Symmetry: C3
Subunit: 115 residues, 3 copies
């Protein structure tokens, strides 16, 4: 199955002025915060990727899937990797998740394919 | 196979002032019109999803595939579902269609994966 | 696996004024140059598709995959087709590549699914 998401980077930027940490720490774990390096476009991107993951599993971000249930990490070549909780991985019955991100000109977008 | 489409919401809005119904009823069935609730961003989205479906099957919207051959519906959790005519489903030899939509900041985009 | 890319058409346009040919001929082969017909939006699109292909294979455009290792061609119905070098196709161990492009309102985007 597939999920996709497009986010205004500027809209993320203005939500990063909502008690700063209060926003970020809702959807990014500390290690994911390290990955984005304070960069609004990278933050927009992880946000878009988590949304896209929730759409790909057809639940959205609710009480079946939290932002923090979705772990994003990077390959040695900076490729985005995505994993769910080992439990959630079984509850949704997932073999593999494939992800990608891009940004240009005020927009971030992400897409996820789930098996 | 995969198809994708990005549409200006504003461009859809200005085509929704082209005898209103004359535009909408070309690509949306009544039930799909109920789903979009007059919202230009949802209409842009279904349009983008139908285009994306036609690209995923590699024919585009012509005389092998009409807009109205593509039925969009929603899951109970508001996930976009896509089906073709039971005939067209065989003519194109499709096992399953997987879809997703998103919009932000003046743009709608959609993607479809066909098996 | 999946890759996606979004490119500002305008940014491509302004790089098409960087000794014109010096830019284009780095990522487009002559036949691919014929396909885009001088159109900045089509050039943006092939660029986005090549980026998306490199992300889908998880290497990016470096010294494991050049822009010119990725050949884009068109079906009789104008569907984008993508092939790698017969060697690279084995080195990355690829069964099939599926691609799609779209542009509207200053943006091109592309997505690739690799088997
Ligand atoms: C790597 C490359 C293909 C991406 O260039 P680009 O078109 O500027 O990429 P975008 O701005 O659309 O997005 C960059 C994203 O590509 C993704 N990416 C980078 N390297 C990647 C790789 N080897 N495989 C898959 N995805 C990759 C990253 O998620 C990155 O975003 P982040 O650093 O904020 O997480 C390019 O640098 C290149 O090789 N040429
Ligand atoms: C549902 C959610 C993930 C989407 O938030 P978002 O980033 O604003 O989504 P976008 O504006 O990009 O687009 C909303 C689209 O997501 C799609 N969507 C909504 N719920 C979904 C679900 N459970 N599964 C898959 N897709 C879904 C819909 O098609 C919707 O568009 P439509 O209502 O016009 O058909 C978000 O509300 C959330 O859970 N947080
Ligand atoms: C073909 C059609 C579906 C695309 O309309 P559109 O929404 O304007 O498409 P976009 O502007 O997003 O992009 C056009 C791209 O669709 C792709 N496309 C065109 N025909 C296609 C087909 N039969 N199958 C798959 N993709 C196709 C092409 O790559 C084209 O870009 P290029 O000509 O620069 O390579 C539309 O003309 C239609 O049939 N209605």
């Amino acid at each position: 199955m597939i999920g996709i998401d497009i986010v205004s980077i500027a809209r993320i930027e203005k939500c990063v002025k909502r008690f700063k940490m209060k926003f970020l720490e809702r959807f990014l774990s500390p290690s994911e915060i390290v990955l984005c390096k304070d960069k609004s476009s990278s933050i927009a991107g992880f946000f878009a990727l988590k949304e896209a993951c929730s759409k790909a599993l057809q639940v959205g971000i609710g009480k079946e899937l939290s932002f923090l249930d979705i772990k994003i990490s990077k390959s040695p070549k900076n490729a985005p990797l995505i994993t769910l909780s080992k439990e959630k991985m079984d509850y949704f019955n997932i073999q593999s998740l494939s992800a990608s991100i891009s940004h240009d000109a005020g927009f971030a977008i992400a897409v996820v394919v789930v098996s």
